[PDB]
Paper text:
We report structures of the [name] isoprenyl diphosphate synthase [name] in three forms: apo and two substrate-bound forms [isoprenyl diphosphate ([name]) and dimethylallyl diphosphate (DMAPP)]. The protein possesses a canonical all-α-helical trans-isoprenyl diphosphate synthase fold that is dimeric in each form. Two divalent-metal-binding aspartic acid-rich DDxxD motifs termed the FARM and SARM (first and second aspartic acid-rich DDxxD motifs) are important in all-E-prenyltransferase mechanisms. [name] is a homodimer with a canonical class I diterpene synthase fold, with structural analysis identifying some conserved mechanistic features in C-terminal closure and supporting its annotation as a short-chain (C10–C15) product-length synthase.
The [name]-bound structure appears to be the most closed form with a fully ordered C-terminus. It has three metal ions bound: two to the FARM unit (DDLID; residues 84–88) and one near the SARM unit (DDVLGVFGD; residues 236–244), with the [name] occupying the putative allylic/DMAPP site, coordinating all three metal ions and making interactions with Lys194 and Lys260. While surprising, there is precedent for [name] binding to the allylic/DMAPP site in other E-prenyltransferases. Variations in the FARM and SARM motifs have been proposed to influence how the metals coordinate; however, it is important to note that [name] is not the physiological ligand for the metal-associated allylic binding site. We observe a role for Phe232 from this site in changes associated with C-terminal closure in the [name]-bound structure. In this structure, Arg350 faces into the active site and forms hydrogen-bonding interactions with the final C-terminal residue Ala352, as well as Asp236 from the SARM motif and the backbone of Phe232. Although limited conservation suggests that this mechanism is unlikely to be fully preserved in [name], these three residues (Arg350/FPPSArg351; Phe232/FPPSPhe239; Asp236/FPPSAsp243) are conserved, correlating with their potential shared importance. The apo structure was solved with a dimer in the asymmetric unit in space group P21212, while both substrate-bound structures were solved in space group I222 with monomers in the asymmetric unit, generating dimers on the application of crystallographic symmetry.
Residue numbers in the entry:
A (entry chain A), B (entry chain A): 0 to 352
The structure:
């Protein structure tokens, strides 16, 4: 598949970087191997595929192997975002496996090393994410230099600078929104635009278009396409994060409420509760972000569906997907791209995991 | 001066990036401003100046303003290394000022925000360092694209990939050396080669040569020059870190012993004590890395000078500086570069701060 072809290009790159760094010893090599295992250990490769479809939309052909490696840099950049997000959220596990800070704290304990095991695991996790990010940029630098016309390089760099600036801004805005207890739908929408719309949809698409041709019309259209679809993707995550079945999502039931995230769905519930039951709005305001029992969580989930926040979320998702498909249909891109991205937009809007 | 010209090029770049990101709101803007204040808030600009002299060594002229901005990327990359090092070391202050995690935890408290103030400060500090590093690479990408011949770009990228790979490896090796209690002089020398020789001397020099011309002879010579001088720089830090006067160094007396660093000087003291007093070696082995009173620290410092570790360190510094000046003198570079770098090598070898 195309995800597998992009994965193989990343697998070969990391193996080369790992061999070239072997002179730094077996401890650093074990760090690089742990990065390999984490990156190549599966995933949908959603962001590289968005770059692939952004390439097909305005290109006459299929891309060279080096351009697939450029797309794979989004996957390595995502490892950086995830590794540092696990430190930010203080998560113990990710997709069933221990987070980096726990793996390296356990390595510390297994060898009866001195000092705090948790300080070591946190330090090593910082450096692991840092490594993923410098190597992700090394891919962009190397592919640009050796495989792209100088015009394609300039367009690729502008997208590369935007995607990393916007994901960093989205992360900081998100932790500020939780700390300041920003209730508004606008605050959550602003974070979703940077963390989901830009970082997951719009900028990946534009990376592919930038690598293919100078199509400023298509770049601006994918901005509007990613704005609707990304917010639809985020709202889907918010519904799953509250009402998802753990056997289907793999996340604990009502994880967003347990973790105190400031989502659009939660923000809309507070607004709808102000309209229909002030005491229900008071329950939400004074419970979000606090240590909740499983009873409190189930109670808050019923209140969220009660005030109609779930129905409003599902209505928004349909509307944003419809307008995203409308934007995609009347677009000066190849019909093959229109069909591929319409498949993705439907899957992202209506999934259960 | 040249440090001021490089600083001004960085000041203008960050102001441009900050204006271009203003649409993300006042909270992220406050983060960018804090990065400005930290980077531009002083410094010797040692690594950019090494890139400057590496440029003069093989160039017929003085560099364009954009090439000075490329040199300033080393200063922004250093902000990343310092911000994440403060999290790794759990330092409360740096050069008199609060570290990032303390500034942002205090911002959290000042606004009566919710959650853990320290978790927020740690999260914000991670993102601050991340920002400095993506923007440092954005400088290298932008200057390469718009100011360098494609041959100069390829040489610059190879140095850029090495310096960030080696500083990351040096950091990980350093925390592994402290956790595993690696006593040997070789372990400390290995860390010093990556953290000091490569990251501070060799790679900065090579960045300047790479931006000027294809002089593989000079690049290999600066590798040998930075190997002697960097280890001399590190040994100077180790002596200051144990025997430095706080009024002169600005660090607390015997900071390296208080912080439990695995330095060459400490490693040599354990080896010399094995030779002259096993019980003194036992005192060092069982005290390094532990919580020490000020009496213990002063006792350990006397033991270090007793076994002659300080004299051995000062002898090594003179020898490495002599061979570094010998390497510099018989080098196919401009005589102006030879005089400038000889000034730096003397200052780095014999300083008190
Ligand atoms: C891409 C970024 C910035 C983080 C990825 O993790 P998520 O965004 O899915 O995780 P939470 O913030 O929901 O915990
Ligand atoms: C460049 C790097 C990796 C860190 C800079 O700080 P120092 O190296 O001077 O700090 P310590 O490790 O001695 O605490
Ligand atoms: Ca998070
Ligand atoms: Ca998370
Ligand atoms: Ca999320
Ligand atoms: Ca340190
Ligand atoms: Ca330090
Ligand atoms: Ca040091
Ligand atoms: Cl909406
Ligand atoms: Cl030596």
């Amino acid at each position: 598949t195309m995800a597998g072809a992009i994965t193989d290009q990343l697998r070969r790159y990391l193996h080369g970087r790992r061999r070239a760094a072997a002179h730094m010893g077996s401890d650093y090599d074990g760090l690089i191997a742990d990065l390999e295992d984490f990156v190549l250990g599966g995933g949908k490769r959603l962001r590289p595929l968005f770059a692939y479809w952004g390439w097909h939309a305005v290109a006459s052909r299929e891309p060279d192997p080096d351009v697939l490696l450029l797309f794979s840099a989004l996957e390595l950049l995502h490892a950086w975002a995830l590794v540092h997000d696990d430190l930010i959220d203080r998560s113990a596990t990710r997709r069933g496996r221990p987070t980096a800070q726990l793996r390296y704290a356990a390595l510390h304990r297994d060898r009866d090393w001195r000092g705090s095991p948790d300080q070591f695991g946190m330090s090593a996790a910082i450096l692991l994410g840092d490594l993923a990010q410098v190597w992700a940029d090394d891919i962009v630098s190397k592919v640009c230099q050796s495989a792209l016309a100088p015009d394609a390089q300039r367009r690729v760099h502008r997208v590369w600078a935007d995607i990393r600036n916007e994901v960093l801004g989205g992360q900081y805005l998100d932790i500020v929104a939780e700390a300041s207890a920003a209730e508004s739908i606008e605050s959550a929408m602003n974070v979703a635009t940077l963390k989901t719309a830009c970082y997951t949809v719009s900028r990946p698409l534009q990376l592919g278009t930038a690598a293919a041709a100078d199509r400023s019309d298509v770049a601006a259209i994918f901005e509007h396409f990613g704005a609707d679809l990304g917010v639809a993707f985020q709202l889907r995550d918010d519904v799953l994060g509250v009402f998802g079945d753990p056997a289907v999502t793999g996340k604990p039931s009502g994880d967003d409420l347990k973790s105190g995230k400031r989502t659009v769905l939660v923000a809309e519930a507070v607004e709808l509760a102000d309209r229909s039951d002030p005491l229900a709005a008071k329950l939400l305001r004074t419970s979000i972000g606090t240590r909740l029992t499983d009873a409190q969580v189930r109670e808050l989930r019923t209140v969220i569906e009660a005030v109609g926040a779930r129905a409003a979320a599902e209505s928004r998702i349909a509307a944003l997907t419809q307008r995203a498909l409308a934007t995609l249909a009347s677009a000066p891109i190849n019909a093959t791209a229109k069909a591929g991205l319409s498949e993705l937009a439907m899957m992202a809007a209506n999934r259960s995991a």
